[PDB]
Design a protein around this motif. Structure first.
Motif, short mmCIF file in Angstrom:
data_model
loop_
_atom_site.label_atom_id
_atom_site.label_comp_id
_atom_site.label_asym_id
_atom_site.label_seq_id
_atom_site.Cartn_x
_atom_site.Cartn_y
_atom_site.Cartn_z
N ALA A 3 0.80 -1.41 0.01
CA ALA A 3 0.02 0.17 -0.02
C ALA A 3 0.98 1.08 -0.01
O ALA A 3 0.76 2.22 -0.76
CB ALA A 3 -0.90 0.10 1.06
N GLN A 4 2.00 1.36 0.68
CA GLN A 4 2.98 2.40 0.94
C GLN A 4 4.30 1.76 1.16
O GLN A 4 4.34 0.87 1.96
CB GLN A 4 2.71 3.42 1.54
N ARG A 5 5.36 2.34 0.71
CA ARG A 5 6.72 1.98 1.02
C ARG A 5 7.07 2.52 2.20
O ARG A 5 6.96 3.75 2.64
CB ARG A 5 7.60 2.76 -0.16
N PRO A 6 7.43 1.72 3.32
CA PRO A 6 7.56 1.99 4.70
C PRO A 6 8.82 2.57 4.78
O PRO A 6 9.86 2.54 4.22
CB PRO A 6 7.77 0.74 5.30
N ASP A 45 -0.18 0.55 7.99
CA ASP A 45 -0.50 1.24 6.70
C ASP A 45 0.39 0.70 5.65
O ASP A 45 0.03 1.04 4.37
CB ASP A 45 -0.61 2.69 6.86
N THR A 46 1.17 0.09 5.86
CA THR A 46 2.08 -0.67 4.85
C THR A 46 1.49 -1.49 3.82
O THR A 46 1.75 -1.26 2.58
CB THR A 46 3.16 -1.41 5.40
N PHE A 47 0.59 -2.45 4.25
CA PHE A 47 -0.14 -3.33 3.57
C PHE A 47 -1.61 -3.04 3.58
O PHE A 47 -2.10 -2.60 4.54
CB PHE A 47 0.22 -4.74 3.95
N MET A 54 12.59 -9.53 1.99
CA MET A 54 11.29 -8.55 1.74
C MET A 54 11.27 -7.05 1.70
O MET A 54 10.36 -6.32 1.42
CB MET A 54 10.08 -9.43 2.51
N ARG A 55 12.32 -6.81 2.91
CA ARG A 55 12.27 -5.49 3.11
C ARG A 55 12.63 -4.53 2.04
O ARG A 55 12.28 -3.50 1.75
CB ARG A 55 13.27 -5.13 4.61
N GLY A 56 14.09 -5.06 1.44
CA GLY A 56 14.44 -4.70 -0.01
C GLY A 56 13.56 -4.55 -0.75
O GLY A 56 13.64 -3.66 -1.91
N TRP A 57 12.64 -5.55 -1.00
CA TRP A 57 11.59 -5.69 -2.22
C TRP A 57 10.50 -4.56 -2.22
O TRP A 57 10.13 -4.25 -2.97
CB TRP A 57 10.92 -6.92 -2.29
N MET A 58 10.40 -4.03 -0.80
CA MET A 58 9.32 -3.05 -0.62
C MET A 58 10.05 -1.65 -0.93
O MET A 58 9.43 -0.74 -1.17
CB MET A 58 8.83 -2.91 0.88
N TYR A 77 18.93 -3.01 3.65
CA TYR A 77 17.61 -2.70 3.28
C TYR A 77 17.02 -1.55 4.18
O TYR A 77 16.30 -1.61 4.64
CB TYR A 77 16.55 -3.95 3.68
N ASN A 78 17.60 -0.17 3.80
CA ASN A 78 17.49 0.96 4.49
C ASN A 78 17.29 1.98 3.70
O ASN A 78 16.48 2.92 3.91
CB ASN A 78 18.56 1.09 5.68
#
Lengths: 331, 325
Positions: free
Chosen positions: B9-12, B19-21, B49-53, B248-249
């Motif tokens: 839903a939004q990139r954290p 609200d991320t998903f 998964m953190r990087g994929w987002m 992943y930051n």
């Protein structure tokens, strides 16, 4: 007879200064069994000398306080008590910052003064040239059409490495400080391009000069240049580490590449090398280098300064971007 | 029939939150030609998964906003209109964070449920296990009697890598956080040693556990741990980079590579896709023979995804995190 020597007097903080070395006169001894006596003729002045002065674990032990300063050189054998060498031989070895070397000729090899000028056995046909040769070809493994980027490109190692890369059919891009160095690389040495990092943004330069990314990075300087180059490496790139000059006189901490994970993203390799590991292959390397030189396919420049006594000052010229070509001290 | 899906839903900023998903209900279609319909059974929850987002250049493109969240999984083929698959087949693939996958089975492979429990095709016989296998053996190239150090050693990749190293006759030293993880590595997995970096000085630990230096460093974490390991590498050491916690930051001791004439090299498991069958086959026999142990942490319920995902970045999972759908 007197042997004048520069001894390491105190470990420098930052740039070496006038109290770093002691100029001492020592009586000239005689070689013992298994030793040779060499009249030192030319000494190699190298950025690595800064590391040799530091008290820090390295690939070679630091120079001891009160010890004759370490230096590669070429000289003439006057007396030999070693079956591998005879009086009249010219040799390359760790001769030290002094008039005469007496000792075991460990790692020494004979050189032929009829085939090249003596000082050239400290440059293209010496350790800088062989560093370029083995580091590029054995570790970098450049291929035809690949893009090779060279840092410290106007230096003794880099200038040779770039020319070898050209001969292998590579696109060759140099990184150097100042307009004259960069002009020299392109117009005289045949580099495809040269980026003046002091007068131009490196990233922008790399964008222009390396449109298909960087396949081989030959690194002599490290620091921010290395870190920026890492952002532009290609898939399966090879980075060869030969030194880090931008770190030598820096106060108290090496600066590490924040972009090192580019090695993951690009599944690339970063590898260190030291030329002495290739000692057994020197004859074939020297032989090939000699033919490239003879055929005019490769050029070598030496900057020759006269007088052993000038050593401390002449050494500083190494870190000034001043020296134009491989720095050699004529004893 | 309804297909429940978690969409991005939004990139954290930092960790994923409320609200991320977006949890959406979609009517279940049927597969078109060249597609399959898969009932998703187990999903892999991975730190990657953190990087994929994140919107940042990598070896895999980011997940799009509004797209079903990317996830590797194991599932059962219900309907196939693709010649490579039949109804009843169990498959591994990018099944997504959803009840059902419908689409082209790109990069999918059939898995044999007689050879291992299904979830294990997401761990030792999945991407984490194959990462360990290829990274260690093809890039690290450990040899008998060499000292192998593994960072993130209690994680899914590291725990497998260390066991493979043991099987190759290496001295195996793990770096992990907490006393229980370290005990588990040594007493259960047969690591020769384990350094608890949270409760003891890493350098001192390395000095004690690696008296002959470090020949192979399998790096999953990077940062200060990598920098400290660099001070202890041996002549001709190999450092294999598989990931980093910061990722992943940089390593100030990198010149150790020069001093020791050592190699630092990155890898990505998908580069070895063509060799997965051989790798899986060997791994399966090690598992069957009890030479290698694989631990899965199985949490139940698709709907728990956002919360369960935090258990991964909270470092509270014990073993490879798997979501039973």
């Amino acid at each position: 007879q007197i042997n004048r020597q520069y001894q390491l007097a105190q470990r420098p903080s930052g740039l070496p200064g006038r109290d770093t070395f002691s100029f001492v006169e020592t009586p000239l001894g005689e070689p013992a069994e298994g030793q040779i006596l060499v009249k030192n003729e030319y000494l190699s002045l190298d950025p690595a000398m800064r590391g040799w002065m530091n008290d820090a674990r390295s690939y070679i032990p630091p120079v001891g306080i009160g010890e004759v300063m370490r230096a590669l050189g070429v000289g003439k054998v006057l007396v030999s008590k070693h079956p591998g060498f005879q009086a009249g031989d010219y040799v390359n070895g760790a001769l030290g910052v002094q008039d005469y070397f007496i000792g075991e000729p460990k790692g020494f090899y004979k050189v032929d003064p009829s085939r090249a000028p003596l000082p050239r056995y400290l440059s293209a046909l010496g350790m800088t040239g062989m560093t370029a040769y083995f580091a590029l070809l054995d570790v970098g493994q450049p291929k035809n059409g690949e893009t090779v980027v060279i840092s410290g490109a106007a230096g003794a190692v880099g200038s040779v490495a770039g020319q070898i890369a050209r001969l292998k059919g590579c696109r060759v891009v140099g990184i150097a400080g100042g307009a004259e160095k960069c002009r020299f690389l392109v117009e005289e040495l045949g580099f495809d391009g040269a980026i003046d990092y002091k007068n131009e943004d490196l990233a922008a330069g790399l964008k222009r000069e390396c449109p298909k990314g960087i396949d081989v990075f030959f690194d002599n300087v490290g620091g921010e240049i290395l870190d920026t180059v890492l952002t532009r490496i290609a898939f399966k790139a090879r980075i060869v580490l030969c030194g880090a000059i931008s770190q030598y006189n820096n106060k108290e901490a090496v600066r590490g590449p924040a972009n090192y994970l580019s090695l993951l993203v690009n599944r690339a390799r970063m590898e260190g090398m030291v030329v002495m590991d290739y000692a057994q292959r020197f004859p074939e390397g020297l032989k090939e280098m000699a033919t490239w030189l003879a055929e005019g396919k490769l050029q070598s420049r030496e900057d020759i300064v006269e007088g052993l006594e000038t050593f401390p000052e002449t050494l500083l010229k190494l870190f000034s971007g001043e020296n134009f070509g491989k720095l050699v001290l004529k004893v």
